[PDB]
């Protein structure tokens, strides 16, 4: 995954040049995901109490 800078950048320095500059520097992020199988439409959660 990568995205653009959605940070509220602190307006002691919030300039257009750095906003254009920080795009060709991407966000190297590998995250994890938990989907269903695409053949299914329910979620089962089981535990013991």
């Amino acid at each position: 995954v990568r995205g653009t800078i959605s940070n509220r950048l602190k307006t002691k320095d919030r300039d257009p040049a750095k906003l254009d500059a920080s795009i060709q520097s991407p966000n190297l992020q590998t995250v994890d995901v938990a989907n269903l199988p695409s053949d299914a439409d329910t979620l089962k959660v089981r535990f013991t109490l």
Partner: protein, 98 residues
């Protein structure tokens, strides 16, 4: 949502459904060769779908959709799924470039 697979393609048409239960509640058959990608003009079948997701985004009766595109692209062309960040564990063979 077809990023590059839409452009260059000859004819595309989109099957959207609404899922009430394990069934089909209402059909939608579209064609992106008669609607634009630059102008968002008022139409005659999808304003009901607009009201559907307007009620959905307000919570008043939820909606599960199945947007499905049928893009005629050419027999054996080169589709474009997305691309991962690659770790350097690979040698000169072993899926190192893309």
């Amino acid at each position: 949502f077809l990023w590059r697979n839409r452009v260059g393609a000859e004819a595309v048409e989109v099957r959207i459904n609404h899922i009430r239960q394990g069934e089909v509640a209402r059909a939608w058959r579209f064609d992106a060769l008669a609607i634009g990608l630059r102008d968002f003009k008022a139409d005659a079948e999808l304003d009901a779908l607009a009201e559907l997701i307007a009620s959905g985004l307000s919570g008043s009766g939820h909606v599960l959709l199945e947007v499905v595109a049928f893009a005629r692209i050419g027999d054996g062309q080169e589709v474009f799924p997305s691309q991962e960040l690659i770790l350097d564990k690979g040698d000169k063979k072993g899926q190192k470039s893309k």
